[model samples]
Target chain A: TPVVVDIHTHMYPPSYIAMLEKRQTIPLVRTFPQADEPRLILLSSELAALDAALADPAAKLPGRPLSTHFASLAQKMHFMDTNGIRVSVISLANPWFDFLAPDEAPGIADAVNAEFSDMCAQHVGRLFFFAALPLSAPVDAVKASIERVKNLKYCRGIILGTSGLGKGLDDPHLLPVFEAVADAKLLVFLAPHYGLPNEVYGPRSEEYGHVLPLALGFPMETTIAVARMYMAGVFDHVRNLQMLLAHSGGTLPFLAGRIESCIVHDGHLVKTGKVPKDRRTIWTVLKEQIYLDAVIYSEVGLQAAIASSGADRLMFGTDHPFFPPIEEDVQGPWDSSRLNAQAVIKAVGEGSSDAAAVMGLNAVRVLSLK
Target chain B: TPVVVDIHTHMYPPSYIAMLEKRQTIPLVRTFPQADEPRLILLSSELAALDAALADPAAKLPGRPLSTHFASLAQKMHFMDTNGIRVSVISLANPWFDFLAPDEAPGIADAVNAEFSDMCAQHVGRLFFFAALPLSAPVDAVKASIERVKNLKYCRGIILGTSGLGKGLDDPHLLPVFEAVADAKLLVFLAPHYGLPNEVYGPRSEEYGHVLPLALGFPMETTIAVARMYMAGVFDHVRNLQMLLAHSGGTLPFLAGRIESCIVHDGHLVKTGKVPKDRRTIWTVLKEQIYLDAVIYSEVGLQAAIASSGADRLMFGTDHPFFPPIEEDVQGPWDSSRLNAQAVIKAVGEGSSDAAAVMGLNAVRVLSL
Candidate 1:
């Protein structure tokens, strides 16, 4: 079998879980009467359930069941083995140190980085990671966290949320951090955890489960964040800012033509001489600076992603420890991982050169796996 | 020669514009100090500029320059000729009678529908229209308007904004309007004129022009509205609902798999018995009840739309009278329609059967033209 690498895998360090347990807000973990595992509560959408759980001791657990799949390195190996994944470039999951207070952020991020670094070293060639940064920390501390992670032998990049500094990734203050990440030759794994305001889901959203927020809002949030970055010319400012977009650049692949068309047609941008003939189009930036994880669930979406970004720029991923099957045993073959892998084969065909590149070789070549 | 049909075209009636000209709020038409043509002020995103123009007499104007193309029937004909479109399914533009008060809505909608019907009759086979609805009126009045429009010679369908009776399409109260349309055998040209709140653009959005809102927000708003309708079981409830989605189902094609996956994986839905083993998937509904317009700008988007919904369900459309080329003369070949045409060719190769189907044949067959 060809080497299968899962670049989108995540891990929550035990120390981090302990930190979460002590918290009252979201990103906190608590033992529930209904569930065996201590339920891990993340996302503002889970708040109503959290309140229900809080109000009534037996009123349905909040958020996802914090299965050992999250914090257990052993289960990570178990999952890799089950899925036939050879190399797993794991990282700390969403809102990564983003929720921390400004004062304590740097130290906690340092510990998390060290934990991830240590986890990878244990597996040697089979594991690597994109480290976390204390984005909530002030500018100097953020810069320091990036430098600290860069020195960690297993650090390949940093996992980033849409919220860079305070405003968004497009913030002028966040440019230095981008410059430093590029300067350190790290790949930025950009993802969205905030999603849209819960209200975008409307009144009937709770009836839809996490479907709207998890599937639509998450990807849409990623698209908007990256668009903001593009609008701010962040790609141009940091020439070496090689970034990875989760869920295949969100909807960027589909919206590229529209995005570019809108930019060109905008009278304000043109009148202000902001959109010059020399400025790179969205496609140029997507193909050049951006890499997309092949996490889109279908051949149709993945095909669009592949069409926009080359096969080499597309890396296979499971988005592991997130959407594990509710029915199937975790240790067995899973649809969550299988669907993404199947999409790659259906899109590029099994045993084809394109398939091999997307399935594993792309990650090795891009991340420089020894 | 292939007889091209532009299904996603719009024209406001003189009475409609006259009403807009009198109103001070959004969806109104006001003559700006800067331009000879009245500016059609619509969308909450344009509110900032509306205020600016209201405050500063010499400030850069608000909203789009309402060219004669908006209300002049002659201009509509001229544009169709320029674009090589032999057939046009004209409709009144956004916020159509949606802004009218309950008492006044039905009459205004009846008049607009009459105007569209008369406009279509003048051109005979070349013109057809999707009429508007008096959604703000009482349920009986709204349904009565549907019956009234259904009787028109050229009225093929109703152009519906996502706001069905105010709350949204998913509102249970609006089911009767949908049932009446289906019973009347008229299509629903569903569109989203109300985009998301302006705050989603973040600060400094003004620097990006209308790109963030127009390019992203509009389509996203449409997607959300449709998704809500699906969740509310609107399609299943009204099995005969033949809805035409603008902008190629507004990213539905790209998001279908995820949407389906999310539904299948949703524990709340599964536990509540909302989902069933034999439930029609989003794809099923898309292929069965929904028709997508080929207004998506690129081959990538259009390809996904085609893949999800069969090529037979995809109709070529030029969102005429909008996105007109600023550089080119109105009479000349324009990029807005030309790009969509080129995308159809690029997606399903030129002169191919699929190309022909999407270009015009599909519209004719689907609309019974």
Candidate 2:
């Protein structure tokens, strides 16, 4: 309540949006017969409209209109002002450079990092950002990109997807990069860029639109990535590594007990000494090494997250520019932002010390934001 | 402190175990030079043990010992007695009749149900059972099998997997079967016969053994299945549909808030008129139509479960014959049972009525015991 900071805010750099607007195929801004606004079409949606939508800047489209709400920094300021969010540590929304080719990754990553740095320079007092790494590039290029991000005036963290250099975050190959990020003192903002295989949601998933993937699949994806890392001993090896898990650690706090139980009970895991009595439990890892975003949108989930990790470890976030109000209430606060804020009040009492920390102070302390 | 009831219990009937023993390939009792005891190996484990373990019940195993702990009824009673739990409602563990050929599914399903019925008959009031259906068979046979279990004296519910028929539980074809169960007033004990595709666990998953799949995959599989049904309007269509969710509703209680938020915000769903303002939320379905087992091992999780669905909606369970003590402390209450028992005391205050209901009375009332 004292000073709300939204650590989970996102924006697409104008350069990145421009790149998608002229893209060869896959995802490009173009018109669909379905609507007149040029669409920023992506995801696994039907591609029949790809060439058709690209047919003309003359006509327009529907899969999420290419709104200025995404690329305009001023629009983010307007959102912050409207909601009284005092500061926002922004980052690019997901699929961030995850789709870029290896050869061009470092260059584009540096380009975007520059845009973010420049933006923060312009807004100096209130804006900071988490830079996206060139994960698809060669190790040297990726490390170089991390170095570039490390010294950026605005970068306090590095945003990451579940897929780390292609083999999922648990891949042993990803260890050096994790060590590098830790050494750089950059918090890893882990979110899901991928989801479970479509079959798991069943055949009727399409009927739910993006709900299943976004609501369930994404969180579960994040949970699995972290669990895999734990199972592979990544957490143990990277002692200083800290992560700000999106979606309240993506069901981790709720399922961590079961994960621990299964680990103890599995004869193979137990006998092999992998389940060493001294190993830090998931609960301990949660409190000590991990931070959670109060973006879970519910009192129950937020409470569980706090119970597992403590109030000081959670920061406020609004997965802005995404989950924007579907109907034309664009001028006001998105339900996504309001719901998360309300959860803090509902979970911890209104205006309590716990509430103040979750609303913004936690972000201030954890990220060393003034 | 009341007569503790164990609702989430499992057993492989003697006939079913015998069938697996004679199985062709895929999964069967086999011996591994790695161990001398014959192993009941399944899952995506290294398959070198299948034919090898089968070569000998002879030499002997490690995947899971084919002990009386799994197929013996008396072993279950002994376990309950050891734990001082006087009541148990047993059912088949997963991969139940799910793998059978269509031609033989009905017969085997009937045979298994009969064995469960006979087992309960011997124990009378203390032991009840949940019958598994011939899901692989044709719709008629599946429906026929549902009809078969409805009248069994010991049957309180029908155990179902996320997969119903060949499609998922949300398939329109599965609607009638749900209706039939609802019509019979039988609760559906939904579990994960399949897990999320293995790749989600990553390449190193095999090193973690059965854990990633059992702990993470199983819960998500159940969560997705119920979400799929809710999305498909199955819960609304079968108003009387009652379900018992294992592992405390498989992350549903914690995640349902987001689920509700997503439904309200999904543009396509709203525009299509599919998500009406009048629609019952996942939370409502959870309260009125669903029951969660206190099988989640943590206080945080159990508290979340009770918060989402009222304490009255929870029932006690022990995922027995699974998650047993790794150190072979087999003479007493397994951690799986005691751990869950403690969750009730941990989540709700000790010896409180809420605790009593979750520990045993909820099972007594919910299942009409």
Candidate 3:
């Protein structure tokens, strides 16, 4: 029987929590009398409500409750076991090292990476991790951090945000970091932090709450980042680079054909000789170098992801500590995790070989999990 | 036995062209010394290049050339005949009456709509139209325009831009307009005009030509507009409203699940009692109230669109007079049209009934062409 592995779980260790609690802005933690736990406010969209809550204690708690599931190793193990997740490859969640000052980033990154390493060490076989990098620091410090994580026993990859050196993933300066990480054979877990500009959602966005930005903005941000990279020839330049796209390549699978069609039909590209006959298309890049987490909530989305990148390249993931059931007990199974699991079984038959591969075997082989 | 209908085609007509020719900004037409036809630049993204072309004749032409395919009914007939299109329901292209002054709109709208009516009349059953409304005009005038277009013999529906009276499609003020349109039983062909703000494509956007904006930005704008409407309860408020989303619902099919999940999981919505138990989901709206055009260029995208809304709701469209072949003869078959046609066949077999419905029969029945 294949041991079920989760490649997309998240954790905020003790040191990281302490770091956030001291902050005054977004990505900061706030304690309110109304909530049992300190609120972990990460998104910029939560800033307004955060301010409102600060002014009035009666204002409903801003951000999600910083539940024990976020920082407790015991809870992670229990949740995994209760949900039939045998092994988990956890990483720091979004806004990871993205807010740190240049001078502070390198040291904080080392401490955070060490904290993750220690957690994985405590539960050797059950926990492996994708480390955080000092992206705000200079290129040398960033590369040095990559080298340091490469030596860690359970460091399988590095979780990256869409903003690379503040110019996005397509920045020319970021190519060296990508090449170094690829050379170290560390997977690039591409995630989204800064979504599209708030103005895109319109003036009435506040009325809708966080649904538009979280659901649409986050995925659209990821898609744009990858599309920019493809257009800038980053994938072709760094051939060894491998990526695991959060949220099933962030709408890339569904939009890949449009991207290709646009590329082929682009008159400027053809006129400028940028659309080479032998150029590696987004489709080719997706299959050759990309892996997608089955975190999308629907079977329809998962099927599209599978169709874009083969079934073998798709891995099951649970975005733990987020989207926890509001009505259910914290110690119980999470509906978020169940939704992703069901999506996998629904996409590929319940007990078929394809399901096994997506659920566990693929992650085992890809990450070299024993 | 099914009649092939091109429900998503566009035409500028002579009157609309004359209007565009007199303008100065984007959505204007300019005659350049280098091009045989006057250049038709409609997008905000093309504005910079339009200026450049104006300053230097050597600059690459801005937007597409206003070929005969744009304003000539005879040319439309020729292209349709060459491509085996049995019927075409054309409409005025982007920036329709969106730019008109509130005072100037009602008159111009009537003139332009009458021009479309005249063209369709010449072709009879072979031609129909989706009329453009003076959105900038007052509520009464806008409603009056809807009533006017509803009575046009060949006007089966009205094409709408994302900007509904300058506040976007979700504006509460526009609900009455939507109600009026729905009450009249006219299908709202929801199209995207002003794509996302130019900044979203980043600094490297210009190097890629119009690909990024047209491919991703346009569809994303449509999706956002519809999403805003859904969030504002537009679908529920106007139950009879029907929409035909361009570019396969602007990535709505693939993203609908995420939208649903987000709605259910959103702490604000759930806590506020806004996430109603019986609220019609985006999936419901897509199948029940929304129709998608088969304009997306890939089988992968088409399949998702089909899955979101059944094959019965999907219709064939050719964004004609746009995306003309860069390397081949314009008089012959266009690769843009062929790509969509091939995607239909590839998604649902070569000669399957599903293909028949998606290719034309659906349009025929739905639009009552």
Candidate 4:
């Protein structure tokens, strides 16, 4: 029987939750009179609702309820067992250490990473983690953190947000950090935190709930970050840099054709000698250096992602604890996990070797999970 | 024999060009001392380049040159003939009547529509058009313009920008216009004019030229517009409303699944009963109400578009006279047309029934050409 592995799940350890409880701004935890669980508000889109809830206890609370699913390792095991996810490679969710001050970040990152290591150690064969980085710190501290995380027994990779030291990933200043990570043989799991500017959704966005920003804005942000890096020649410069993109490469597979077409047709790039005849294309980079999670909830998106990067390159992820069932039992099977798993089965067909590869074998072989 | 029709092509009528020439701001035409032809500057992304050109004759000219391909009827026929296109359904390009004054718009739109009608008359069966409307005018005037355009012999549809009366296409005020157009049996060809805000491209956008905005921004804008309309229940409300999306539905086919996932997963929408069991899905609207142009330049994108909407729903198009060959002869066959043509054949196999339909028969049947 093929083993099932999940590489896209997230966790917020007890200590991290404590830090979030003390914060006053967005990405903080607060209890509302209307909710039994303390709410974990991470997005700027929730600010208005947050203010309303604060003003009056009768108002609807903003953000999701922070259930034990977010921080309890025992609950994680229960989730995996219920979903038949044999092994899980976990990491902290978004707004991780990006909110911390430069001076405070290194220490917090160390503590958080150590906590992850301890949990993975307790679980032994069942859990591995993608450690968080202190990105806000100085160059030396950032590099030192990578070296420290690399030696941790259960740390296989690092979870990275799009922003790097205030400038985006495309900033030339961040190249050394990327190079150092690559040099350490640690995979970079690229995720989106700051979505596009809110105005892109227009005036009527609030009426649609959080759907537009969460779906369109999040993917667009990740796509833009990767494109900027591609245009900056980061992939060619750091030959060994590998990335695992969330939400199936954030619409990259779908837009890769357009990006390539635009690049070749661009007169400025052509005239300025930036368009080399043998230049590495986005397609080439996707196949060579990029890996995608099977977190996209539909077969259509999964097919496109698999088409862009080979099935061998894709790893299954549940995006667990987020998108929990609103009406069903919280301790029971999650629709989010089922949606992704069904997508894989539908995309590659049930009981096929390709299905097994996408569901678990790829993650096992790629991540060296025994 | 299958007839090849070009449905996504554009033409700037002589009258529209004259309007452009008289303007001081963007969407204006200005002759640079360094260039032979007057530059037809459009797109807010090109504003910085326009400023540079205006300040110095030495600066690289902004926008594409205003060639005969833009305003010449004979050139359009020549393009169709050279590219093996048997018939062409043309429309005014972006910022079409969008910048016009409310008082001046109706008259100018009439002139432009008349000019298109006359040009189609000269070409007879070889040319058709999607008439331009003065969206800036009042509701009555807008309706009147639609009525007038529907009467024109060669008018098949109306070319509309994303902006409807300065509000987006999702504005409730535009629902009646959509109803009117649907009622008139005119296909609403949805195209993007104003892309997303320039700030999204980050600080290094200028270095890459127009690729980001033209390729990514344009499609993203169109997707946003349709998604907004869908969320507002416009598709179900106006059941007969039909739309032809440019750039192969502007990444809609690829993003549709994600959009659907987001909607069902939304706690607010689910709690509010917006996620009804019988609620029409994006996939439903895409298959039934939407027609995509085969203008996506690659097989990968065209495949997704075909998969989302059936093969019969896609029509071949050449976004010609716009992405003119930079290195080759302007009067010769364009790579833009070739790219799209190749995509159709590659996606559906050469000489197959599906390929034949996408190449032209679909347009003929859908538009009653």
Candidate 5:
């Protein structure tokens, strides 16, 4: 039987938490008199909560609590063991070196990545990691960090946020980083940090909680970032670049067919020879270069992702510690983890080889885990 | 065999075109020296073309040409006959009564809807229409217009834009009009006029032409609007309201199940008891009160929409004069209309009863044509 592996789980090291503790804006950690743990507010989507928290201490807490699941290695191991996950390739979570001052970035990034290295070293072969990069650093500094991360024991890849060099991943200046990462055989786990501008959800979004932004905004942001890269010819330029998209490529599996159809049928794109007939289509790119984490909460979405990118490319992920049990106690198994596992079961019936691959083997093969 | 009906077609009456010809901003008509006909600029998506026209008269004209097909009764009859459409329930094309000044709105809306009423009156048993509302007018004026339209012969519904009272459909101010429309038993044809803020498509949008906005943004806009309305509990307040969504409910059919799952699993809404266990889900609303026009151009989208809503709720539409043949001559069959027709054919198989319903019979029965 193949060992179950989780490649999309996240962590924030103690050093990174210390950095967040000093800041005032979002991505900062604030202590409330009423709450037990310091609040880790990250999203612009939660700006209203942030504002209200400042005005009224009694108001509902802003952002999620900085739980032990974020920093404690023991808690992570327990989570893995509880969910029957034999191995986990953890990475530093979002706002990862994105907010560091240019001068402070490289050193802090090295320290933060060293902490991740130390955490992986403690568990030996049971745990692996994707190091965070100081995207705010100079191009040379950013490239050097990649080399640094490659030398770390048990390091398989570098987790990335959508933002690259302050312009976005599609920015032409980021090509060297993409090339270096691709050449090093490091998988890029593209995640979403800055979601769509909050206005897109309309005025009544507060009534829906974080669902509109967390579920829709996060994935759609991933899609837009990757689509921008595709439009800018980044995929072709860096042909070896392997991407693992969160939330089933953020509706890409379902929208890929439409995007391809739109590209071919577009008069300007066709007439100008921008979208060449013989060129690799988005569908081809999905099959060849992209893998999707089956975290989309439904069988329909999981099946669509599999249909677009193939079953071998779909890996299981539990966005653990994020969407925890809303009502239940903390020691219990999380609904967020079960939702994804249940989707795999429903999509490819229980005990099936396809389910097994999605649950773990796919990640092992794709990330080349020993 | 049930008669084929087309519910999502549009026509701009002669007077309405004249009103557009006198204006300058978008939703206005301007005569180009190089072109034979005046251009009708509507969408904000067409701002690039409009700007290009201002810079160079010779540039491939801005907006679609204001042709006879947009304003002629003979053209409508010919289009219906050519497409094998036994009946057409038409409305004025978008930016409808939206751009009119506050005072001028009710009058222009009355005249335009009257022309539509008279045109359908000419066809008597064969034609019906969803009248245009003067949304720019005061609330009472808007309600009075709805009352007037309700009395008009062959008026089956009222066409709507996403901007209701300029605050969007979720605005509390717009609820009265929604209530009045529902109380009057007029089916609302929800359409998208405003798309996303345009920056979301990225800098390469202009190179893609109108496809980005027309293909993706329009549908996304509709989905966002409906999602906002759902979050606002518009469906709960107005139980009698019936809406026929354009562009296959603008991605709602595909995203409905996800939206439902998201709402139920949302921590804030779940904790607040906002999403009650017995709450009517988006799926329920889609299956119960909403109808989708068969205009999504692809089988994948069509199948998802049908799966979300029943086959009995899908209606045929030929978005005439828009998405006209990009390569084919003006006199030839439109590729846009053909794509949608082919999608239904592919989804339900050619000559199937479901195909008949999607082709026209659903519209006939729903609108009582």
Candidate 6:
């Protein structure tokens, strides 16, 4: 039987969970009488609901229930076994140390990374992790964290959000960090935390649940982040920086050709030589330096990503502990995991070697896990 | 012989140009003493330049020059002949009548529509047009203008900006207008005018010239406008409202699958059942109600648009009067026109009948031109 590995899994270490419990703003934890689980409201979308629920007992709940599964080790193993995932390369979830004060971020990042190191050590070969970073810290501190994490026995990379140094990932200020991470040979798992402003979802967004922000806003943010980076010449500047784009390059694989076409036809870019005729296209960069997690729920998306980035660059990922079936039993197989698995199976054919690679072998080799 | 057609072409009739000349903000026409042609600044992107040019004599001129090419029917014909565009369907360019006082809008629209009708009639066989509407006028007045224009000899459709009744296209108030246009059998060529709030493009947008707004903002606005309409059930509400989307559906054809997937996976949509499990998808809507202009300028984009919709729904367009070449010598064969043409040839094979349809036959059939 082929080994099954999930490279896109996330965990909130007990220490981080404890930290979240002490907060009042978003990324804070709250308990509910209607449910056994405390709700974890992490996004701006949940703010209104959070306010309403706080004001009235009868208000519709905001945010997802903060299940023990979020931070418990036993739960992780149980989820792996239940889903047939032999190993999981987990990372800290979104807004990881992104909201921390400059002085507080590095210490928390260090503690969380150390906690992750200890957790993987306990699990031995079954658990590896992408470390968190104190992005709000000084540049040297951020670089130091990358260096520190690279030396950790189970640390493979860092989980990054779209915002880099507050100006966005396209900021030239992020180039040094990209270079440092690249030099350390750590993959940057680019995720979206701050989705587009609520206005873009329109006045009717509240009627859509979290779908517009979660599904569309998340991917659109990632696409915008990477596009801004491409336009800013980040890929060219940080030549060796490898990024594993969450949500399959945040629609990059599908939109790359369009981006390229836009760049060429853009008179300003052509005039400024921002789009040099000899420049390496997004397609080339995707094949050479980018990897896409097979977390998109559909084969139409997977095929587009694969066609743009090549199949070899794809790795299987289940955005575990998220997208839980609203009404389904937690102990059962998760639809999130199943949706991704089914997509890979449908995209590459069931039980094929390609499926095997996407399922596990690719992650093991990419992260150098035994 | 392969007959080329330019559907995305634009113009500001002399009467419209005169209106622009009197304005102070964007959509203004000003003459620079240093430059021979009167400059036509149409976007907020040039507002800073517009301010500076007003303040200083030597400030870098704002907007493109109001060349004779913009208003002269003879110039339009010359452009068509030079580019081998056998048929040209001209329309009033962006920010058309949207800024007009409600009282003045109806009359201005009539004059502009008459100018287009007279121009097309002057050329007889070669010129057709998508008429302009007094969008800022009263609802009844707007409907009346549409009804009047539909009867114009050469008016095949109407050009529309993304803003519908000022709250964006998704506003429910615009449904009656959409209904009237659909009832009139006039295809609505949806174009983008107010390209976002100008803040979304970041601080460095000015350094990039109009590319960020034109390239990214323009497409994104169209996408958002259409998405709002989709979310609001615009297609379901108005069954006959056919839209000819600019910039190849503004990335909708490529992003349609994702949009559909987003809708289905959306917990809110799922809970409310606003998006039915078997509801007509963006794909279905694209095939049925939406038509794309062949002005994306790349085989990659054009192919995706064709794949989402079909070749039959794809029409040829030039987006001329804008994107004029820097070198006047090369102006005869405008790259914008050639870029779209080459994209069709490259996407459908150079000599294939599919190429023929994209070049002319599709537009000829779809708009009944």
Interface RMSD of each: 1.2, 0.9, 1.2, 1.4, 2.7, 3.3
TM-scores of chain A across the candidates, in order, are 0.96, 0.94, 0.95, 0.95, 0.94, 0.94
Better of 5 and 6 by lDDT: 5
Residues B33-103 of candidate 1: C-alpha lDDT, one tens digit per residue: 66788888886788788878888887888888788878789999998887889999998888788888999
Lowest lDDT 10-residue stretch of candidate 6 chain B: B322-331
lDDT of 6 by residue, B210-311 (tens): 655566666766877887788788899999989999878775665665576567656666776676657888878989999998777767667767877888
lDDT of each: 0.87, 0.85, 0.88, 0.87, 0.82, 0.80
TM-score of each model, in listed order: 0.96, 0.95, 0.95, 0.95, 0.89, 0.90
Instruction: Tell me the TM-score of model 1.
Output: 0.96
**In angstroms, how far off is B302's CA in candidate 4?**
1.7
- Model 6 vs. true fold: TM: 0.90
- Expressed as tens digits, the lDDT of each residue in A255-360 for candidate 4 is 8877887787778888899888899999999999999998887787788888889999999998887778767887888887898899999899999998999998
Model 3: residues with Cα > 4 Å off, grouped in runs: A24-26, A30-36, A41-56, A60-64, B24-26, B32-35, B41-64
Off by over 4 Å in 2: A25-38, A41-45, A52-63, B25-48, B53-64
The complex in candidate 4 yields a DockQ of: 0.64
- Give a tens-digit lDDT track for model 4, residues B9-121: 88888888888889877778877778877788876788889889889878888987887887778899999888899999999987799888899999999999999999899
**In model 4, where do residues sit more than 4 Å from their true spots?**
A31-35, A43-55, B32-34, B42-64
Question: Tens digit of lDDT per residue, candidate 5, span A50-164?
Answer: 6798898667787878889897899999998888888898988887888888888999989988888899888877788888888998999999989999988889998889888
Tens-digit lDDT track for model 1 on A1-370? 3689999998888888888989988878988666778878877767788888888867767777778888899999999998889999998888788888999999988888888889999899999999888988889998988888889987888899888887888889989999999999999999888888777667778878888888789888899999999999999999999999998988888888778777876778888898887999888998899999998899999999998989989999988888877666767877889998899988989999899999999999889887
Candidate 1: stretches off by over 4 Å? A32-35, A43-55, B32-35, B43-63
Better of 2 and 5 by DockQ: 2
Worst 10 residues of 5 chain B by lDDT: B323-332
Ranking the candidates on TM-score from highest down gives 1, 4, 3, 2, 6, 5
Assess the local accuracy of residue A199 in candidate 4 as a C-alpha lDDT between 0 and 100. 76
lDDT of 6 by residue, A1-370 (tens): 4788899888888888788888888778787666787777787767888778888858888777667678788899999998889999999988788888899888889899999999999889999999988989999999998989999889989899877877777777789999999999999999887776677656666655665566556776777677777767788898989899987876566456446655666667677767666899887888888899888776656776777677778898888887666446778888778877887888899989888888888788888886
TM-score for candidate 4, residues paired by index = 0.95
User: RMSD of candidate 2 to the true fold?
Assistant: 2.6
